[PDB]
Amino acid sequence: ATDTGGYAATAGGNVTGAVSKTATSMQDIVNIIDAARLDANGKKVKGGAYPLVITYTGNEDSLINAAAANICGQWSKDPRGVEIKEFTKGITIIGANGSSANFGIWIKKSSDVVVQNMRIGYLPGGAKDGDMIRVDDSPNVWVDHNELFAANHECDGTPDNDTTFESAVDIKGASNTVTVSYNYIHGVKKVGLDGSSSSDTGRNITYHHNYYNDVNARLPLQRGGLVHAYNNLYTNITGSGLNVRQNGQALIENNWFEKAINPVTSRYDGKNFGTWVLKGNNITKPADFSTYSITWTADTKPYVNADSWTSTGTFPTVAYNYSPVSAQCVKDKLPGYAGVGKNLATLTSTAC
Ligand SMILES: [Ca+2]
C-alpha cells in the first residue's frame, strides 16, 4: 500500500527486505542510517543498501519543557537535527507512543521517506534553519500523524525579527510529490514553505486532515505548482492562511475555518497572483465570515483575498484516490485522529 491520500505514493521503508531497527536517541537514528548504507562486504551503496523501518523510542521532554519555559533562549543555540541525505531505498521513521524529540528531521535529495507518530517541539536554532521537518529535493515523502509545536510568538532582537523558531514543515526544491497529513500543528509562527523563493516554483503537494491551532502564517506559503488542501481544521490563524503565489493553483475543499485572519490570500509579491477553487468548506459565502470569525486585512502591495469567497481559477483532475468527510465532521472528529498516539487512525465517513 503506497496510498497516502495525496500526491505522494510511498510505503517508505515498509517494503520487501526491510530491516527493522530501534533508535533510543537522535544519535542512534544517525548511526542506523549510516550503517544502512553498507553492503555485505562493508562497501557503501549509493541510495542506501537496504530498506529501513526505524522505531524511535527516545524521550526529550526535559529539553522540551525547559525550552517552553524560556522560549527566547532557543534561537541562538545550535540547531539539532537528523539529516536523511541521498537515501532512496525506502525509509520509515515512526515514533513509539510516548516518545518525543527536541530535534528535527531534515530530508535532502532522498525519496520514499515516511515520518510518523513523532512529537517534535520547541527546537533550538531558529536563526540557523532549525526546522522540525524539512523536505528538500525529495519526491514521495509522507509526513503523517505527527505533533509539531512551539510558541506562536516572536521574541525581540532575533535576526530578521523572524527567527525565534523556524518552521514545522518546510518544502523546497524538487520535492515533486508530498503528502502532509493528520498532523497536529500548534503554536507555530511560520508553518511551512512550498517553494523557497520566487524561482523555486512547482511541486504537487497535498495537505489533508491536519489540525492547525494558534499559528501565524504559511499554510503553506505556496510558490507555483499545485496544492490540494482537504479536510483540514484551521483555527486561530493569527496572520494569514494559504498564501497562493507565483501563479500557483490550489483546490481548497471540505475544510473548517474558524477565528482566522486572511485564511485564503495571495499577497507580498504584488504580482502573479495564484488561484483557488473553493468547495465544501464550512464557509460558503461572505455572510459566513461573521459566523466563524473570519477577518481580512490589506497589504501595502497589490494583493487578492478570497473575501468574495469565490473560485478565482481552475484545478487539474486530482490524480489520486481520496474521499473527504464533511467540513462539520472534521470540526467534530478531527482532534481525535490528528497527532501522535492515535495509532495512525484515519477519519472515515463511517466515523462521522
Ligand atoms: Ca526553514
Swiss-Prot record:
Q: According to its UniProt record, which residues of this chain constitute the active site?
A: 218
Could you name the Gene Ontology cellular component terms for this entry?
extracellular region
Q: Which GO terms describe its biological process?
A: pectin catabolic process
Cofactor(s), by name: Ca(2+)
Where is it localised? Answer: Secreted
EC no. given is: 4.2.2.2
Record-given protein name: Pectate lyase C
- According to its UniProt entry, this protein's organism is Dickeya chrysanthemi (Pectobacterium chrysanthemi)
Phylogenetic placement of the source organism: Bacteria, Pseudomonadati, Pseudomonadota, Gammaproteobacteria, Enterobacterales
